[PDB]
Every structure is written in structure tokens, then in C-alpha cells.
Amino acid sequence: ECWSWESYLEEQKAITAPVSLFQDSQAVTHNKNGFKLGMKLEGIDPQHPSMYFILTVAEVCGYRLRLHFDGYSECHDFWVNANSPDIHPAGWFEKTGHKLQPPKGYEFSWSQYLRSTRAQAAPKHLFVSPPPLGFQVGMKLEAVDRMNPSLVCVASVTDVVDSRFLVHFDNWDDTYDYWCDPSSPYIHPVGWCQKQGKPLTPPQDYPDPDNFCWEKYLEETGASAVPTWAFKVRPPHSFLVNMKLEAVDRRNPALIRVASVEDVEDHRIKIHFDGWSHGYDFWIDADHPDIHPAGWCSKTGHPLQPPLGP
Template identity: 65%
Template sequence: MGHLLPSETREAVFQAFPDSRNGFKAGMRLEGIDPLHPSMFCVLSVAEVIGFRLRLHIDGYSECYDFWVNADSPDIKPAGWCESTGHKLHPPKGYKPNEFNWEKYLESCNAQAAPKNLFRPQSSASSGSVFEVGMKLEAVDRKNPCLVCVASVADIVDQRFLVHFDNWDDTYDYWCDASSPYIHPVGWCQDNGRPLTAPQGEHQTLKHSYPPWCNSGRRSPHGFQTHMKLEAVDRRNPMLIRVATVTDTEDHRVKVHFDGWHEKFDFWVDSDLPDLHPMGWCSRTGHPLEPPPLSDSVTQGVCPTPGCRGIGHIKGAKYTGHHSAFGCPYSDMNMKKEVVLPDRLGGEKQITFVPVHFVQKTKRLCPDEEEEEEEDGKEDIMTDLCVCVFSERNMDSLQQALHQSVFLSAMSAHPSRDLPLCWEQHCKLLPGVAGVQASRVSHWTVEEVADFIHSLPGCEEQAKQFREEQIDGKAFLLLTQRDIVKIMSVKLGPALKIYNSILMFKHAEDKSDADT
């Protein structure tokens, strides 16, 4: 039987009841940290207000990069904060940093800056901090928790500082305070018999370390116990808060289970995560609370996934709902793959759009681990396609040629590398695709993707399906053979043409980069 967290310790262990109302309004502008680039302060808009929570939009970029915070989050600051504290402000796309002016920008947007009194009061504690920018430390890589890496203090704001892993990009950075269990003084790994991951391509002697006593007190016990009830943000669908139960605990983490849901949706989080709330938090702040789904409840055709009411989308805040497994955050097809987005700053890099607690493995592998295959069930997909390719005898010449062409490239373990072998044949079969690069396709709207699918021979019906599924250019380029053939139930002929086109777009991009 579940029980409440004792009131005397409730405030100490997780997000307490706010002592003020949420005064933010949609359209207000502010500054804040990009959660996918924690070192960057950006120009933000309030896109949505629900209870004591805000959905924030990074001005000038797609809604798929929107994110949720509490109204008292330390990650958000009033307009002008960066200038007053000497931090670099990254302006909206199209603006040069040295040309951006808040007064002119607000006037051009016909918008209002969020009043300063709405933000968390700024602390002066950082002035007496023992930490300094540039200090070295040994820190846990929170995307790969079995790694302890060489790191530096990259920034200090109030009582928090930014941990940056030397010679790695800022997507691995994170903010913490001096009591964090993830940071250690130089020499900690050696003293505790743990391997230390050195910076890429370097073996350096660490100097100017922070004092080893500065976090010796460490974080006090969190107070969570198994079977305790709480209200927790759904990390797969962050617009929702669900009734939840603590099912396991560690020193600094808790395992959260959503009541009425399968245990495969359980997840571990840090005990001080601001997405964990006491019972009654939603009622007190005016936020809807998702009750446990009834075992005999019917989805009424909105979404085939048990328990899902069609709210939210795997691609984030850009879409508010879905009606199929393709867009469902809880469907089996989406549970088995990480949600990735093209880096909004450009380039070929893709960023995992799930919290670090969900990341099972990245390219920075833990010691003694072997890299797993990139696609589960790839062999099964290939076998299915092979059978279909050789069993359909009555195809017209175009279809038969396409089968052969795709077979040559798509059946390879590295289709993008082997694509040039049949590039000439690809271009003859689908001339409308030739020369179009993936970077251009990534900016296509849902309508443009549907129009393109409609232009492919024999794919008119599939165009309607792509439009209904709200697949834009970014999502289109991420489609795999399994998505098209098995999940979207597209017939083999049209599926091969569609997947073939995706390969061609990507190859055109690679070819262009090689030529330059």
C-alpha cells in the first residue's frame, strides 16, 4: 500500500509547493539555458503556461526544440541578464550577437519582456564560492554513468557551476552545485581504484584542482522510500504529470513507476529532480494530473497503445497529439529507439532528445563494453525484404529495377557508403530526386513531404498517409526500413521507392561535402 512522504522531510527531498503564483504569460520573452547545449544562454519565448510550468521556445528555431521548466527554475533569467553578468547571449537565428538589442527586438516582435519579479531571486553566494572558472575536477559523465572523466569548471552562476568535459562538445555539460555526488577532486579515481577517462587524444597532469574538502559534506539523504506516492512529470511526454510510485531507491536516485502503466516505462532519476512533486502539487498549482489508466479502459480509436489518450508526440512539442503508433511516445516502435534531433546549430551532428536518465548508451562506450548493433532486428528486416524482392515476379520493369537498385544499396551494412555503386541507376529510376540534398529536405514542411511522396510513381495513396502522420522533412530523413515497411504498413513497392529516395538525399549531401 502506498504512503505519503513525511511532511517534515517532504520539502527537503523534492520540489515543494511553490509560495507564489505563476505570473508568466504566453508570448513573454526572457533568457535561459538551452537544455541540449547547457553552456548556452538563448533568447526564449513563453509558448505555453500550464499551472506552475512553462513551455519555452528558442526564438528562431523549430518548435521541436521546445522544453518545459517550472516557473521558479534557476535556468531562466530576465531579459538583459546576460549583458549585466557578462555572459554571452545567443540571439535568435538570423541575428548577429553584436547586433542584437533587446529593446529593438521586443518592438519588432510586439512582445513584452517577462517582469523581473517573476524570476527566482538571484543569490550572491557565488561571490564566496571556492570554485573558480578553469578549475579541474573528475566528474561522472551523466550520459554514460560508468565513466568518470577529466572535467573543468566552465561557468558559475549563483550557487551552481557548469561541468565541462575537456575536449568534448557542450552537449555533455551539466549544471550542479557543490554537494553534487557526480563531482570529485583530482586524484579521486586513483584513490578509489576507478579508471579515469582522459580527454580525447590527451594524457594530461591535472593542476589547479578545486579543494577536496569543498563537497566533503556531500548531499544529505533524500528521504524517499519504496511505495511512496508522488506526482511526476512524464519524461517521454513532458507536457503531462502522472500519479506515480517510488519502486526503488539508491543513494542519490529513485526509480519512478507510473501507476497503471507497464513497468517498462519505469525510469531512474536524481532525487532532487524538479520534475518530482508531492501529492497535491498539481491541485495546488492548477496543473492537470493524469490519473492511472483503467485496465478495462478503451482508447476510443485515438491511439492503439494501451493507456495512451493520443496526447503528445514522439517528436516533441511541435505536435500536440497523435493517432497512431508512429507518433506515440509509448509505442513499442518508439520505446526501442532514442529520439534524436538534428543539432539546431547546424552541421551533421544529431542530438539525443531525451534526458540523460533515459540514455542507455552513446558512442562514448564504458570500459570493457562492446558496441551493440545499431539497429535491433536488422537481420529480420533484411530477410523480409529479400524474400519480397525475389518472390514478386509480375512487376513492371520500373518496379523490378527499383527492387534491384535498392537491394544493392539497402541490403549493405553501410548503405550510405555503398550507394555510389548504383548511383547512376538510382538517378535514372527516380530523376526527380537527383541532386536534392538532405539539408534541404530537412526543412520541408509536412505538405512538402506529402507532395514529394505523391510525385513518386505509384505512391499517391502513401502521400495521404504521410500527411495524416504529420511527417515533416526532419522526421522523413529519420525513417528506417522498419518504420516504412512494418510500422507504417506501406506496401513493398512504394516503400522501396520512398526509402531509396531517403538514401539518395543523404548521398547527395555526402557527395556535395566531398566535392567541397
Template identity: 60%
Template sequence: MNVVFLLLEFLPFLKTWVTLPPLGYSGKTALACTWEEKEKRGQSERHPRETFIFFFVFDCLAVPGKKKGWNWVSYLEEERMPAAPLKLFREYQSFPQGRNGFKVGMKLEGLDPEHPSRFCVLTVAEVQGYRMRLHFDGYPECYDFWVNADSSDIHPVGWCEKTSHKLLPPKGMEKKKKEFNWTSYLKNCKAQAAPKNLFKTLSTPVTPSGFRLGMKLEAVDKKNPSLMCVATITDMVDNRLLIHFDNWDESYDYWCEAGSPYIRPVGYCQETGTPLTTPPGMWKEKLISCLSQKPCELCLPHNYVFRPAHGFQVNMKLEAVDRRNPILIRVATIVDKDDHRIKIHFDGWDGNYDFWVDADSPDVHPVGWCAKTGHALQVPLGAVDRVGPVGQACPTPGCHGIGHVRGPRYGTHYTYVFGCPYSDVNLNRENSLQDRLSGERPAPSNSLQKCHPSSCFCCTCSYLKPGSDLSSFPFPDPDLDLQQALHQSIFMPSLASNPTHRLHLCWEQHCRLLPEVSGLTAKHVAKWTVEEVVSFIQRLPGCKEQASVFREEQIDGEAFLLLNQSDIVKILSIKLGPALKIYNAILMFKSAEDN
């Protein structure tokens, strides 16, 4: 307290000062005010944010004998860049009204971010500030995900039953004949349901005017923003809509607010000349019929008011969740923008880590959000020396060993190659986890946009005009295709000569060469520990010396299955002969799983 009073005495001598808003205040994020301006408005007109400067600066004051800590006030002054004004943030992005009351172990219901139409049984696995990591009951931790405590995607126990939504039970329980019962489940788990008062609730249920289930509209595909597609409203919760693309699978679904800029009425593309990706069938005739009806009850109203473009500007500062390592929030700068998105750059990091995010994303917050919610903030890369080391060192510049490329299952990593989310080998590698529900692995990142099996109309090529510039479209790399073809001709000659043959035709032949793989599948290998992987490598003919590399890199069964030939040769520095045997074994494991 003495420090605060001392600050009050010397504050008038400061040339300028900057304040941040207190909890819940809906004004500007930062206010630069000279004392001359303050005298003009009079002492009696003390601004409601002025007192906050004392507490904020107190938190940032250096303790005698220690290095001065990083703080936003000094940083904004050094960078000569503005903080993004608080008025630009949505309510759920801004400073929360209360604390996070969720505790580890509490049970709840919530949406699966990879399957937005599915409500699942969840458990709070970790709490940090106003955020928490949620775990799917019965599934590995690698599928865990982070949300804010006021997220609209989570609900109290019993919500699905009350609102007539289907709740997916924990893994293993869906096969039982009895219906899932929360009371029995909580009793068997000896767990507590999260109290209802912890969840965000609207004061009155909101039904967006003009919307109804089954309505047709035209919507942007968020996974490929260049596509405008035919869509249907398949669910409504409060003021949010579930958008489903006709003839596409549910993995492309997403929730949005009624005024979202991503949805438009039927006929919008025709009026604006925007290419429309349509499902197979008589869509053109349906469109003409729909537009001829006034009004059409099955179409989104043309006079509906949509939210205008955001007000964020390039060079504004904010705090953003690191999508490669969601446990972390970093100091960030907006380096680009369009009408509905902003491009995030983490200060001090290479531009290769930049990414686009919706301007209304719950992972974007105003300056000071971490400090007010009790969440750790990762300072800019160049400021590390001022605040000291954080956690285990990692060879990747700026990485302190926190997080893991394989998700929350591993809290830290100590190797550059396969553990670090920021290493070169992992930078452009897409999520290689099996789908939690179907068990399918994602398509290679170099492939074309995934299409519904019954339609070829949802591909980018479906609306290319003659003479269009094809350089920007994601066609397969011919060199990569050639490399894969050569690999097949060397390792699986029967496949190269006849692509319709399956690998099981030469299984017996491969097992004679590598008897160690006989009877093993990828599902079994994925559960191996590091030592079990090492033991397997030692048993492969001529690979005993290479086993130590897998121990040094801490490669377990799951990581082992992710290796490709280039990883083994170039990253692990294993000679071609042993590398071919190791990679061929991986291929056989995966083939045994498929068969």
C-alpha cells in the first residue's frame, strides 16, 4: 500500500499516463491523457477509469533487487502502436463480469468443436484463469480442447434432455441397451455436476426474427473461405444457428449468430455475381421457384440486417490464443484484415506462424485480459531476457518447452523434432489424429478440398471459368505424386502394376521379410511406450544401432506411426537401408489396420 500512496504523490509529475479499463467497463481500451487536459475538465470530473491506473501500475512495478518485468504500458509506448479499443470486442471477448468458478473434475455437456452438431459428456480437466480444458469422457486426452468459462458451447448437466437435443454418452456406454442417465453416471464416477449458475445464460430466450429450422441460405465455408455454398439451418440455440452445407458431411458445420456476415439469403450469389457451389440435382430450378415466391417461408429473408464489418485496424495490439499451442495466450499484432477476419502475428515471432482468425473469435481478447482474469501471458520474444526463463528450454527460438504437438496429453516437450509445435517439421503438418468418432484419419494436406462422395459440385473446380488463373488453387503437387508412385513401385510392385490390388495380396511376402510386424496393427502400435518402440526397432534386421535415436527423441507408438520416409532419413539422420525397413514396417502396420 505504501507503494500506491507513493505513486499518488509522484503521479502529477508524469508527463503522460495510460489507463486500462476496469472489469466490465465498456469504454476505450487505453486513454492517453496529459495533466493539462485533466485540469481543463476539473478534479471533480475524475474519469471512472483513472483509479485503475494505480492498481495496474502497482502490478507492473519492479520489486527491489529483481529485474523489471514486462508490462503493456511500457510496451505500447516503446512500439508506438495502439491497443485495440475495447469497443471493437464482443462481450464474450472482453473483460468478464466475474471469476471462473469451474473446478477440475466437474461434469457438463458441450459441443464437440470437430463435430459441431454433436453434444457430448465432458469433464473439466484443467483450469487457467478464465479458461478451461475440457475432456471427452472415455476418450484419450489428445482430443481435449480449451474454452472460455462463459462459452456458449457448454451447458449444465441435463440441458440436452431439457431441450430435446441428443447427448452422445461416453465411449463404451453407447453400446449398452440402457439409456444414458446422468444421476447414475455421476454416482458411479463419484463426480460432481458443474453448478448451473456457472454457465452463461441469456436473461430471456432469444429466437432470431425471421429464422426457422430447415431454412435454405447461402453461406461461406469457413474451412475454405473462397467457397460460397448452399446451406440449411439444422439447429437453433438462443440466438445462434447451426449451418449445414447440403450434401456435405457434418465436419463442415458451424454455429454462428443470426447476424453473422458468413450467411446470406438465397439469390445473393446470383445478384452479386459470386460463384455458388451447389449440391447435385435441380438447384437452379429450385432457386428460380424460391425467388418467385414472395415471401418464401423456406428462405432467409432478403431484408434481414446483417452485422457490419469489424473495426479492427492493422498494427493494433491485443492478446490472442496460440492455436498451435492453445494452452498459451500471446502478445499479438494485427498485420492484415478483411471484412470479417484479422490476421494475427505474435510479436517477436517469424511471420510463418501468422494465421487468420474470425474477428469475433472467442480466442481474441483486449490488452490486459490475461492480467485481469489471472491467465499467464506470453510476452514478446525479444522481452524474454527481461522476465527470465519460463519452463524447460527448447531449441526452437521462443519456445520454452510448454505444450506438445500431439495435444494436451503431454504438458511439455524436450525434443525439437517431434514434440515442439513450432519446429519446422511440424509447422505445416495438419492434424494427423484419427477422427474421434469415425476413426478415420484426415486426408493429406496436399489433396483437394474434401467433397461429399455423392457430389463433385463442391470442388473449387466446379465453378472455374475458362481462362481463370489456376495458380492459386490447391492442385496436387506432381513431384509429390511422382515420389509416391516411385515409392510404391519399389516397396509394393504389385500395387504399382495394378492399383486396384490391396496390400493384403502381398502381406505374406512382406511378413517373410519383416516377421516382426506379423500380427500387429496400427491400433496396437499406437499404444506403445517409447521403450516398446525402441525394443521393436532393435528387433528389425540391421536396425539395432538406430534404436537409440528413437529413445533420444522420445518417440512413442503414436509418434512412430506419424513418421514418413523423409522424417526418418532427413530428421532422424538414419541411413537409407535401415530407414526403408522401418518405414516399410509402419506401412504394414497401417495396412493391417485397414484390412
């Protein structure tokens, strides 16, 4: 007989995390995924989130897509959901004042590229269709380095796309950049660290870095602070320990597995994959696009890995 959530919950005397605990985008199962193998589009580089590349659909599975960077190694391929805000139709860059990195080898033109590759651009209607109030390119703020999360750092808004904006760490590598929205718990107004008595990491190689002063720095750069009213942090999530859900595997991202909430924080949850070592457990933001309610895989046509049996 087929594995099912209902039988498993019975066997385990367990419960699922209710759909209400998830963002609409994590829960939605009734959208069609119309993307097809070989279709071309634009998207951010996950490793360099400020940069936009030409991407090809290399695989379709349920409501997910594997994307390939045209011209580059297969090593760089990555999976997104079809409702990702990180992908856009051909021509988006030109329409929105962004720069498009060319395919490896490449003067660029979408019409000639499509002819050369005998390919079709993913249609505009295959993509899911308001600016973040108070966040504009060039404004400054304080932000948690999510790669070094004990550090709150001098940061800037360097891009704005739809309802989100890009946080960049002043004079640090752009690999530390990340997109977020005005409710992120990782961002704060200029002056927050002083107010909390926490140390603030200044821009890389700032002269006399112990005497870093926001007033002086804003004078040096002519930049404004993001206004305090703009920051609208979200309430803690309501996931509880032992609730079950579905989560993308971190070792092999093609796979999605049966998962449990092992531990919680205000804004994160710790995932355990049922049946596997606790050594694989990992923390993830509660709004991460790769966690889903029970039944997401079944409703979207994606295989679900059942728990590893004893």
C-alpha cells in the first residue's frame, strides 16, 4: 500500500503543523507549474544575490524547477519553486533598470540569443504577477550578517524589486547580501546597536574602526538612514516542537522528505528528518520557501520521501 500522512500520523500518534502557520506562498498547491524543459528566463544568482543571469529550465518536478546558468558548470544548478520571486521573464532587466550578466562566452540581445539556441523564453503568464514602503536604494541600516549571525553590521539597501529589497554589507563582499522585506527580524534602524548596548561591525577596513560614528559616516557618504517607521518586524511563528511537515533535503535538494519540528526560536525552527540521524538536523527561517505543510508534495505532484525505516 502507498505511504500516507494519515496512516503515519496514526502510527506515530503525531500531528501536522497546521496550514495557518505557513505563509500563503509556502502552502499554495493549486497553481499550475507551466514551465518546461529548455525554457529560458532571468534570475538572481543565489551565491551573488545582487546579480542577474540568464537561466534555463533543466528539470521540472511538481511545483519546482531546477535552473541552470547558461554557459556555466552544472555544479551551479539550483532548485526553486515556480512562485519564486527570484525569477523573472526575459526582458525584465531592461524594463527595471537592472544589469544582466551574459552567458559564459558572450553585445547581448534576447532575440538573437533565442535564435542561436533555438529556444523559447518562458512566457510572462507562467510567472506569479507594491514597493517596500520606506526602503530605497542608497539608504543605510543595521543588519545581521546571516553567515555570521552574532554580528550586526553597517549595511545599505542596494536594490529594490517588487515588495523586497537587497541588504548589502558596506565594503564587504557581495556574497553576504540577502533579500528581505520590511518585517525581517534581521534588520534594524541606524542606532539600534547603540540603543541595545551591542557592538556594531563597521564597514570593512573603516579607518579607526573603534571610533566608527554613524553621524560622521552618513556625512561622509551623504546617505540617509532608512526611516524608523519603515521597520515592521513580524510576530514570532507558532510552530511547536513535534509538529510534522515537509522540507526540502539540504544534501540532495531534488528530494523532499517527511520532517518534524525538533526545536524552535521566535523566528526559526529546527528540522529533523524522520528516521535519519539527528546529525542532519538544521535550523531554518520559518518563512523559508523550502518548508511546506503536510500534503504539499502530493497536491503538487512532487515525490515525497517517507521516513527512513528501522
